[PDB]
Design a protein around this nucleic acid. Structure first.
Ligand SMILES: Nc1ncnc2c1ncn2[C@@H]1O[C@H](COP(=O)(O)OP(=O)(O)O)[C@@H](O)[C@H]1O
Ligand SMILES: [Mg+2]
Lengths: 754, 788
DNA sequence: AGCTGCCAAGCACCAG
DNA sequence: CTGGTGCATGGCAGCT
């Protein structure tokens, strides 16, 4: 009652689940905090049932809360970034731990996926790149120094963890890292001279190790993510492009929702990492392209088999951590049994990279056979109770089970002997913890129980008895069952000793298999959805013949209107007039997604695409202050290799201010930055730009008025727009006729000056 | 699939399927012994929803029947989970006696828990109404009716068009919505929770009239002012039928219905309710709302009333003057009254349970506690000079007789349920004391028998006990049980003990048990009798709770007016608003820096203000605070200014800026009058430069020329600052800002005339746009300024 | 104080 | 017809 307080002092920053019979119960500010986060009641007490702790842990873990469980003492802790149990994770989403800190120079950043051992490090130069890395990686738990000056970056996030500055010390970090990987220096990983990144990585690794209190043999590498390697996209751009998340917070009507028909959870997670990290290096890209074309035919044969491999990545983490439960080993075995078939289907594929994926996939004949012999066809969830080791694997175990079954058989025949011998049809032998084995007669017959029967328990409508004969065989049964259970466990632990020396090759296999899932999926998508392989050019350019928006074309059952685009150094900017209504916005967004998909190595939705090198993609599409802030970010960071998409800036202030800013932005983008730009606008005055300056041109969307409506066509045409539609839309909407007549008069007089 | 005709089924499932056929779309809890049972798909869904095992009930012919269930004593926890997810549940109980039934015992559905018909304290939120509504659409309009079942408040309206109806659904936010099958305007209603499609015949007018008249004890509905209102009666008739089928008892707290006419209140459109953040902020939460600031009531029933008032400003001048006078009269009495009023609690909802015959012992206890506060309240209120307050004091009643009854009937802190007894107090019923006397000369008797028999046998482990399964016993340990009297009759054997019975203990077992059941039966009969004695006074009781709720509300507005520095507004004959040193009641309490008070002068000669000023300058706030001040004035409340004079307002419209803007605008243009307050916040969107502005201009014209509404017109279009020149009624005001050096300061002060200039370039500059780009845009701007 | 397993009260089922 | 057995979740006896 009183001894909760002292144990809450031991871990004050973490929710304290306190065992109390059938529930775990929280008090003080833990009670308040848990009641609001879990839709359960306050009293200051709260509670959850034992049978569904893991179901409530996972929701608290999902919202950034660590949880200490007190069984007395704190015997378990789960932190949001360091879980690896399947019950606590989402199958198709990464769950990362991260660490951030700040020099007078710049930022250091590390992420770890504790289930795959995927360990990354980076060194963002400034505020904006740092924020872009946080949105992209979206860590479930975020370690930061007490020192941290730029709290604006992390303030709102879940799972913040304030750490002392000495956890970020260079030399401790190097030593910890060199020890984890078994190296003398980090040159082999290309991070030796990246001290900011390393300091973050040393804090992260220390915190991971302290949460597990176990070696982490699956974390054998770290890699550095350099800015120049990827197409940079800021938070706002990422969100607007609706890559994995839609604007409304969901996962549907998203690029992932269309491109992601992978068949294994590890493949779905890898695909989403690729979509969020397009790379500038055409070499990787052409190689992915070639794989996708080469696998076109083999797709229907590959995917059903690949689905049976399952989430080998996360199973392997539990092997590494030595928490892998029997059905984990059963599914690892099930995946090993897919490998030969997969190897046979891939043998033909004329593709150097598919053949490398084929080798790296491996076979593991020995381990397949080991687990075939070692474990039954479908074992229970836990080793705990046995019935998991297969008969014929250990001579000793088969013998103990035989002695148990033979004692148990004698007792069933004892039941039949005592029964027909006494003439009592209700007579039977049962078993429970309180009495072990007993003979049960019903009340009504119990008064004819033989006098040698020692009564031990009266029930409402039966009596139970023991005899020495019954207790003798109980001993045989329980001591046999008991040694067999201890043997099962020791044999199971030994499977871990035999499996674990092949961990490195096994992680290489699950990675290959995950990649194969991604590429085989993208191949099925390209072939299915009528995509085409884009080509790369030396100079900045985008030439698209009949491009579509990859999401909108699947998601609406209206025909989708494909469109050209021609951007070069000689034609760098299009001023897009006409109604928007989603037509311009869709056209600009589909441009960015074709760029993104090209630079992920996927085929693209078009008859043809040629595309030059892109460093960054900016899409300001969707207060005045925020439009202007995002515009400011484009004008400070865009280059002649950037793709810029602006959506009618100037809205939200005066006509002349709005037009002056738009004109000065359009001109800056065209003559100073020279970025490749689609500048959507409502200002007809801006269509005079092509005649004042080189490299700019007018396109537009039009609309046809028929019947009692107006069809907003989505066809992009050359030249400026020569009609507006605000008044036509107001008329349809029921604005009184006399008001529109007056608006039309007013419109003519305002426009006739300009 | 098995052909499961009637004859193929067992008597149990014959009975169950007849019952389920009367509740085909909703879960049925079927009482079978100690369990509520669900079958077939109900079992599978219950299993998913409630987290319970899906099992089977064996069958000799045909298929095995899917089953899930809960023991009867756990039912309330399970109904709560279901009601939270908007599920309805038919509760079916056993009526007959199994011992005198050859076949299955008789079973009826005795209630149906649905999201809008709950009245139990654990299933509701203290400070939020939970309404059942019904909606109906005509060739020409809407019928709508609401019921708060846990108060009896029954309302009827006839919104004339789509937007009024939308605004009504937003204001009332029904937890359950019964609608007619031929409803055409589904956009109003889909994606609403607790949606219940109903057959047309449930909205038939003669049936409605007939049921409502039957319910109220009347021949016609003339005295209620709804005889006139068949569109509304149809919705009300459906509602009343639903209420009666869910509760399956009489509903004597539903003694009245009232029509809500357009003219009796200020109709706020949907955008206005949202944009003023009355009880919900613009991100769905309750923080930083008008209610969060104004609502320091001390009773749940008063909290709800205050929110209903905030949502329905009244236009009756007399009612408003009375509330205003109450607020001034009571200002010194707030610190005294509030701690007492708090102790009354939620008498409203308790009397609902009383009416429903559902009230638990702690309900009658709290009702008794409330009666005990009435004397102290009467005394505090006699001194207060105010006819309205004295009217409430009298309405509040005293109920000395019923207070006395509950003090004699029930113990001080009774248990949660009457099921286990221990509720009725000593001395109230002599037959009950007489029965208690027997099952109580009990543990004194059993200790005596225990010591007597231990000392007589000389067996020192001998104890006396009870066990629900085997009854009373004499226990002796295993090692001493071979020494027990030969008289001792073996009753129950255990591992290390043996339990026995003797005739004297068996007789004492029979007398204690038959008398414990007799005492419980009589308690239950006396407690049901408590209802029969309270119920005849239900009308006055309901009026007392209403008074207490109003008192709570008004006392609160007094305290708020004092603490937050509000003054009494005055009303005038003609449309107009005159504010001196007015403030946004909510923004001024959250801002960490002083609030800049601002004037307003609207009148029939000065009825439209074009408001300019920079982005972040305070235009929206100024417009909102105007509406909030009107709103508070028209609930009787004092108001956040130094002085306010305001004429009659029929309706507040808001448009805060594609087909939706233009449709909303048209609605304002078709339905505004010279008595309407209209807030247009930066409207006018088109596809080209002037397209949208031209519409805003023509719209302003129509508002000034034809409608003559009091209109506040925030705009970024400088071209509209020319409107005063061209049209009577229109004037320019602006929010002051100063540009010193390289930067803008926002003064937040309204001044007459057009702003000096627009400030988009400066705002863009402040947002980080490169200096080089701001230089070039200034150059372009001066080209444009040289045109005119 | 923890863990296991009987029992509630209707009804149908199942062998004899 | 008889005398037995199954059957959800939660209460708590009975054993440790
Ligand atoms: N009278 C006032 N005194 C102090 N601050 C104010 C006042 N009115 C508005 N503000 C502040 O200025 C900010 C912007 O106000 P807003 O009405 O939205 O300006 P606008 O509509 O012109 O863009 C608000 O956050 C509010 O806190
Ligand atoms: Mg505004």
């Amino acid at each position: 009652m009183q001894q909760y307080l002292r144990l809450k002092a031991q871990h004050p920053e973490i929710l304290l689940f306190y065992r109390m019979g059938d529930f775990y119960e929280l008090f003080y500010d833990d009670a308040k905090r848990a009641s609001q986060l879990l839709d359960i009641s306050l009293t200051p007490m709260a509670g959850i049932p034992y049978h569904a702790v893991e179901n409530y842990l996972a929701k608290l873990v999902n919202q950034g809360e660590s949880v200490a469980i007190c069984e007395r003492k704190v015997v378990r802790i789960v932190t949001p970034g360091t879980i690896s149990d399947e019950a606590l994770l989402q199958e198709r989403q990464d769950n990362l731990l991260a660490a951030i800190w700040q020099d007078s120079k710049g930022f250091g950043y590390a992420t770890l996926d504790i289930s795959s051992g995927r360990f990354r490090l980076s060194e963002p130069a400034d505020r904006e790149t740092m924020a872009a890395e946080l949105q992209r990686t979206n860590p479930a738990e975020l370690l930061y120094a007490e020192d941290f000056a730029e709290m604006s970056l992390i303030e709102g996030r879940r799972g913040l963890r304030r750490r002392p500055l000495w956890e970020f010390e260079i030399d401790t970090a190097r030593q910890q890292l060199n020890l984890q990987f078994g190296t003398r220096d980090l040159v082999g990983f290309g991070v030796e001279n990246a001290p900011r990144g390393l300091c973050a990585a040393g804090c992260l690794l220390q915190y991971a190790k302290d949460t597990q209190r176990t070696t982490l043999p699956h974390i054998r590498s770290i890699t550095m993510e350099r800015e120049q390697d990827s197409i940079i996209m800021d938070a706002a751009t990422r969100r607007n492009l609706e890559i994995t998340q839609n604007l409304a917070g969901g996962a549907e009507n998203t690029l992932a929702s269309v491109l992601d028909c992978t068949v294994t959870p590890m493949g779905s997670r890898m695909l989403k990492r690729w979509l969020h990290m397009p790379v500038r290096d055409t070499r990787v890209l052409l190689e992915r392209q070639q794989t996708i074309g080469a696998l076109q035919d083999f797709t229907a044969g590959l995917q059903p088999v690949l689905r049976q491999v399952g989430d080998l990545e996360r199973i392997l983490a539990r092997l590494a951590l030595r928490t892998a439960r029997p059905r984990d080993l059963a599914r690892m075995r099930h995946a090993f049994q897919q490998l030969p078939e997969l190897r046979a289907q891939l043998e033909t594929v004329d593709s150097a990279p598919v053949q490398a994926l084929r080798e790296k996939m491996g076979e593991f004949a020995e381990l397949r056979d080991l687990l075939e012999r070692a474990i039954i066809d479908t074992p229970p969830v836990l080793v705990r109770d046995g019935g998991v080791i297969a008969s014929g694997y250990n001579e000793e175990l088969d013998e103990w089970r035989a002695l148990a079954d033979g004692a148990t058989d004698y007792l069933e025949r004892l039941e039949v002997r005592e029964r027909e011998r006494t003439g009592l049809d209700t007579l039977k032998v049962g078993f429970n913890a309180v009495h072990g084995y007993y003979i049960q007669i019903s009340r009504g017959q119990s008064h004819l129980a033989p006098i040698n029967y020692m009564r031990r328990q009266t029930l409402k409508n039966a009596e139970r008895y023991i005899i020495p004969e019954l207790k003798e065989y109980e001993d045989k049964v329980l001591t046999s069952k008991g040694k067999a259970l201890a043997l099962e466990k020791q044999l199971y632990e030994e499977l871990f000793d035999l499996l674990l020396p092949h961990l490195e090759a096994l992680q290489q296999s699950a990675s290959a298999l995950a990649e194969l899932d991604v590429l085989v999926n993208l191949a099925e998508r390209a072939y299915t959805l009528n995509y085409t392989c884009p080509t790369f050019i030396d100079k900045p350019g985008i030439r698209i013949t009949e491009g579509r928006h990859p999401v909108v074309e699947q998601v609406l059952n209206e025909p989708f209107i494909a469109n050209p685009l021609n951007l070069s150094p000689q034609r760098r900017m299009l001023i897009i007039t006409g109604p928007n209504m989603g037509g311009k916005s869709t056209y600009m967004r589909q441009t960015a997604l074709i760029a993104l998909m090209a630079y992920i190595g996927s085929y693209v939705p078009a008859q043809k695409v040629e595309i030059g090198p892109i460093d960054r993609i900016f899409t300001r599409v969707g207060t005045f202050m925020v439009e202007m802030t995002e515009t400011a970010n484009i004008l400070h960071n865009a280059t002649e290799y950037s793709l810029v998409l602006m959506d009618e800036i100037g809205r939200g202030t005066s006509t002349y201010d709005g037009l002056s800013l738009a004109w000065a932005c359009a001109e800056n983008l065209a003559n100073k930055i020279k970025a490749l730009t689609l500048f959507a606008t409502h200002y007809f005055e801006l269509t005079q730009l092509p005649e004042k300056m080189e490299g700019v041109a007018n396109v537009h969307l039009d609309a046809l008025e028929h019947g009692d409506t107006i069809a907003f066509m989505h066809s992009v045409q050359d030249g400026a727009a020569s009609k507006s539609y605000g008044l036509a839309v107001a008329a349809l909407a029921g604005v009184p006729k006399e008001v529109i007549k007056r608006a039309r008069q007013k419109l003519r007089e305002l426009e006739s000056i300009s």
